[PDB]
Design a protein around this nucleic acid. Structure first.
Ligand SMILES: Nc1ncnc2c1ncn2[C@@H]1O[C@H](COP(=O)(O)O)[C@@H](O)[C@H]1O
Ligand SMILES: [Mg+2]
Lengths: 576, 206, 22, 52, 105, 49, 57
DNA sequence: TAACAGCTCTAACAGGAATA
RNA sequence: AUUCCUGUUAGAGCUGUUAAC
DNA sequence: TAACAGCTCTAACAGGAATA
RNA sequence: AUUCCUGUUAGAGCUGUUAAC
């Protein structure tokens, strides 16, 4: 069974689903595994008799692990990761002292090293929002308890071996959600973790599992068999009428490395008439992340704790401009709402198709797709005939900043509109390089008075500079002053970015003048750049950057006209 | 290269030092071409057995002592390697010896701790005319932070009549060993030091 | 009676709370 | 014990399974012979690949 | 030490991988004396430029990754460090690199 | 193993961060770090956070 | 103390468990492929013998 | 999955030297 | 590659917005 | 410093090849 | 000296216990 079909099956019927999580989820909860516990026990045992410093040598080192394992093999102990080893080393270290064994197992799996990850939190959310009612576990540490307490804010009813029969009653009276540990909490005398204790099953917990088999279907994750008592309990649960109404979904991180016991149990279950399926869904964490993703109408209150990254942190406010102040190149566009034109097409259209129609027709208007057009209707009639046009109406953009941030098409459209507006009534030529727009001093009109201030900006030692011309050592390359103008969405504001550049008349032959572009820009220091930026502000706006609110409209003689207003003074902020 | 002829003549004279120096001068044609070859294969014929071993002199020992400061390995081959019946035994021996002398590492201790240095001190007898001379030298087999592992020996030094290093000499050789270990591991202390001496440690030596 | 090594193990498992009478 | 046992296996000059002594002891003995024969070696330390 | 003359043949063949392998293999004479030195100054003549940098390859990174597990620091020197106009620039950079690679901080 | 994009998944980010603070603990005799700064040239996805 | 964990550097520098000159590591229990040595135990803890006194060294 | 928009990055080259 | 990051020429990666399949 | 006892090791030779 | 360390023949160094100088 492929994983996607399993996800669809689980989502279809998620209200009746027991979970079974034994020692596999704890690997990802920040607490040591079975092998880690074994290696820790070996470390204590070796350091104790052979008097060696405990903290001097670590445990996850390869050399120390090999040395300790060689020592263990020297005394005839089991060789390597073999059965009857974990219980063997426990009973060796603690020499049949179940109180000390319990205390050590509590300390190793204590509730201070546990850091809940997405898997346990998602399962606890499923428990609270009441899709899964029974979560059986062969695991001692309170990972699911802590996750439920963190998410729901309510105490979770954990069941164990002390009470034993408490869980069965809860099932009968429908006191969901129930979280019955088949091997019980470590806070109590009986832990049932050694191999001799792992051959028997508690009668009442066995009956509870048998009764829960009929009510729900089982999904077991992070479980690799190797336990005889749980395997025989599951086999007995199979051997009864309508054993699983929703099928036993045994999930493993890897089907290839799954033990043969799981596969033969699945085959036996299939032979007994149930629809048990073995699937691979990767790790438990990824499985539960996907399951939560497919969950519909998850409450916001619990989802604010399930996925803490989903909520937006670091909303640290910025201080006031009170009390040297950098002067950036950002002109704030205080326009909040604009009007655009919409055309309805009888057939679906593609943004590429509209772009090629722009290239062919070359109208005196702007258009984009989302089809929002800015300009005159007759231009659109030239682009689109009456047959393909259903209606032409109006569009209002109440929040320009949110609109451009949401859709990049709106960003490009508004950038092109403001660029056309700024260069509508001025002699400065408008070109494009890649996806950016450049306002460049024209070659013929370089002697204009409105450029003279710019001529002062580039001048050396206060004399008259040059604005346009030919490269010193180029055959045909022509150069001019220019400004790259862009639209930047910052927070909830829109700004115009101006950057002084040296435009080259041939587009593809810019690199041949690189040295010149370098040479002309070697000494454009803070004062010179300040002067050039002021001159460009004056050219583009017509007013000096003091207390100005110049307003510019694109296509003023058109029915659909966009009227922007940009402060003539660039952004500044005095130091604190 | 060819062994210079006078060596054969000095073979009759029974002068071990002269024979070793003549062999070194024979190999002197290989001093300039050190880059071309990695391992030299000096062969000592059975006819030179008269100077192979005699009181106070060891031919292979003298040859290697003369060639080591020149930094060129030799794998001396005598008639024994040819004689020896089982060919695979000698072939394994020479192949491993040559590969390790070139600069390679045929094998390394699996999962060896890089923070432990295993020192080993031994000694040798020189039968002086008036008394005895005890030559004590140390060796280290530590494993550096890299993947390869090191194995370096050095003298413990002016005159010793007993094989027990005093306070000064033992602390000096151990400080030199500590500096040697520090140089490989960026400067980290050895967390555990093993010392294997052939004789008991004195109270001052500990 | 108990071997000193098991006494060491028990002391080390819980040494945060154990007295010392001299 | 384990350190010495492992050390008796990294003698490349030896073409058999192990030795009687750790390689530290045998190489210290070999260099002791070398130094005893030639007194003008005491200044410098040498690698095992030279005298092996 | 002296690089093998086969390095020149490989460089003429324009094979970066084999050139890096040969440069590393030239280090055995120093590896017999790894305790002797702290930092190795590997020089590359301009004639090897054809293998310095081309697509899907970089000689400097290959050399660094090949000699990193061997624990010996290496200060690669190109002809640029020689022909840089100023001298205190190169001297300060090389000296601080040498001190950092031999010891540290 | 293979990455088609420069954004680490949940498991890979967790593994790298685990190796990082384990290295810090080894260099700090087990003491937990109190401030962690993860600088990335690209934006952290939801999985990385 | 040689098996107490997570101790600050200053404390370990201060104590360092001094130094162990008279090494004495416990022999393990008898336990239970045995090896048979050639040594025969002698349990005669004391014996009686004679002394002669001489007028000259 | 196929285009299209923006934001940002690296991958190869080239390249000159600290307010003149 | 003693260094530095300034540009050029390209491609990807993410987001999106449509059309689907 | 001259014997004596034991423990232990190296110095020179010689010497065969791993359950027969 | 491809190696291994089993024997033989000797001597030295450590400890001790005496005799003293
Ligand atoms: N992240 C994980 N998600 C799901 N199952 C896991 C995960 N990690 C380990 N397991 C399983 O847990 C088993 C180990 O449990 P046990 O050895 O019985 O304590 C392994 O055989 C794995 O198949
Ligand atoms: Mg040899």
């Amino acid at each position: 069974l492929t994983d996607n079909e399993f996800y669809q099956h689980y989502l279809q019927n998620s209200q009746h689903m027991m979970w079974f999580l034994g020692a596999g989820t704890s690997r990802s909860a920040g607490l040591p595994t079975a092998s880690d516990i074994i290696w820790d026990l070996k470390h204590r045992y070796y350091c104790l008799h052979e008097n060696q410093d405990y903290q001097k040598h670590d445990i996850n080192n390869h050399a120390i692990k090999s040395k300790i394992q060689s020592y263990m093999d020297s005394k005839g102990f089991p060789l390597q990761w073999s059965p009857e080893e974990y219980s063997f080393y426990f009973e060796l270290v603690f020499r049949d002292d179940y109180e000390a064994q319990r205390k050590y197992l509590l300390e190793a799996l204590a509730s201070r090293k546990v850091s809940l990850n997405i898997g346990h939190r998602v399962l606890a959310a499923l428990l609270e929002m009441n899709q899964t009612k029974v979560v059986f576990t062969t695991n001692f540490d309170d990972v699911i308890e802590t996750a439920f307490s963190d998410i729901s804010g309510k105490h979770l009813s954990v069941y164990h071996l002390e009470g034993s029969y408490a869980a069965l009653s809860a099932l009968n009276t429908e006191a969901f959600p129930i979280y019955a540990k088949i091997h019980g909490d470590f806070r109590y005398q009986k832990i049932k973790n050694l191999t001799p204790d792992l051959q028997t099953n508690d009668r009442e917990i066995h009956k509870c599992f048998l009764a829960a088999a009929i009510r729900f279907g089982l999904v077991v994750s992070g479980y690799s068999g190797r336990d005889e008592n749980v395997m025989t309990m599951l086999r007995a649960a199979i051997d009864q009428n309508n054993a699983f109404p929703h099928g036993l979904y045994w999930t493993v991180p890897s089907i290839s490395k799954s033990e043969p016991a799981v596969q033969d149990l699945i085959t036996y279950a299939q032979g007994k008439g149930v629809r048990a399926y073995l699937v691979e869904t990767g790790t438990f964490d990824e499985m539960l992340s996907k399951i939560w993703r497919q969950v519909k109408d998850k409450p916001a209150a619990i989802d604010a704790k399930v996925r803490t990254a989903r909520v937006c942190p670091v909303s640290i406010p910025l201080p006031g401009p009170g009390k040297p102040a950098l002067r950036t190149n950002a002109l704030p566009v205080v326009t909040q709402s604009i009007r655009c034109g919409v055309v309805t097409l009888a057939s679906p259209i593609t943004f590429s198709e509209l772009k090629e129609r722009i290239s062919q027709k070359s109208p005196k208007a702007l258009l984009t797709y989302t089809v929002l057009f800015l300009g005159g209707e007759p231009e659109i009639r030239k682009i689109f005939s009456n047959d393909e046009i259903n209606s032409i109406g109006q569009y209002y953009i109440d929040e320009i900043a949110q609109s451009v941030a949401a859709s990049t098409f709106l960003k490009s459209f508004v950038e092109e509109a403001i660029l056309t507006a700024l260069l509508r009534e001025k002699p400065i030529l408008h070109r494009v390089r890649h996806r950016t727009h450049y306002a460049v001093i024209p070659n013929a009109s370089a002697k204009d008075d409105r450029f003279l201030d710019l001529r002062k900006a580039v001048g050396f030692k206060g004399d008259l500079g040059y604005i346009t011309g030919n490269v010193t050592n180029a055959k045909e390359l022509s150069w001019a002053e220019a400004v790259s103008i862009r639209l930047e969405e910052r927070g909830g504001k829109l700004w115009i970015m101006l950057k002084p550049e040296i435009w080259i008349k041939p587009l593809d032959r810019r690199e041949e003048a690189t040295d010149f572009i370098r040479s002309r820009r070697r000494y454009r220091f803070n004062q010179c750049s300040y002067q050039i930026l002021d001159a460009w502000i004056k050219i583009l706006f017509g007013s000096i950057g003091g207390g100005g609110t110049v307003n510019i409209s694109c296509f003023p003689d058109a029915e659909f006209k966009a009227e922007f207003e940009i402060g003539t003074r660039t952004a500044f902020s005095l130091g604190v | 290269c060819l062994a210079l002829d006078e060596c054969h003549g000095v073979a009759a004279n029974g002068n071990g030092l002269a024979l070793a120096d003549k062999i070194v001068q024979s190999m002197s044609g290989l001093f300039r071409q050190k880059h071309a070859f990695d391992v030299l294969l000096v062969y000592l014929p059975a006819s030179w057995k008269k100077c192979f071993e005699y009181d106070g002199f060891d031919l292979h020992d003298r040859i290697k002592a003369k060639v080591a400061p020149l930094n060129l390995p030799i794998q001396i081959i005598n008639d024994t390697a040819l004689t020896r019946q089982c060919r695979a035994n000698v072939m394994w021996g020479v192949s491993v010896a040559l590969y390790a002398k070139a600069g390679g590492i045929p094998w390394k201790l699996a999962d060896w701790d890089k923070d432990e240095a295993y020192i080993g001190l031994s000694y040798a007898i020189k039968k002086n005319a008036e008394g005895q001379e005890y030559t004590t030298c140390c060796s280290q087999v530590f494993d550096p932070d890299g993947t390869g592992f090191e194995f370096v020996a050095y003298d413990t030094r002016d005159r010793k009549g007993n094989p027990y290093l005093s306070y000064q000499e033992m602390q000096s050789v151990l400080s030199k060993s500590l500096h040697l270990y520090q140089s490989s591991h960026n400067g980290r202390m050895p967390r555990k030091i093993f010392i294997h001496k052939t004789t008991h440690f004195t109270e001052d030596e500990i | 009676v108990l071997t000193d090594n098991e006494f060491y193990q028990h002391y080390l498992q819980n040494s945060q709370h154990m007295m010392w009478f001299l | 014990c384990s350190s010495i046992l492992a050390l008796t296996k990294v003698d490349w000059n030896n073409n058999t399974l192990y030795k009687k002594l750790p390689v530290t002891l045998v190489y210290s003995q070999v260099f002791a012979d070398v130094v005893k024969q030639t007194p003008e070696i005491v200044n410098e330390i040498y690698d095992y690949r030279f005298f092996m």
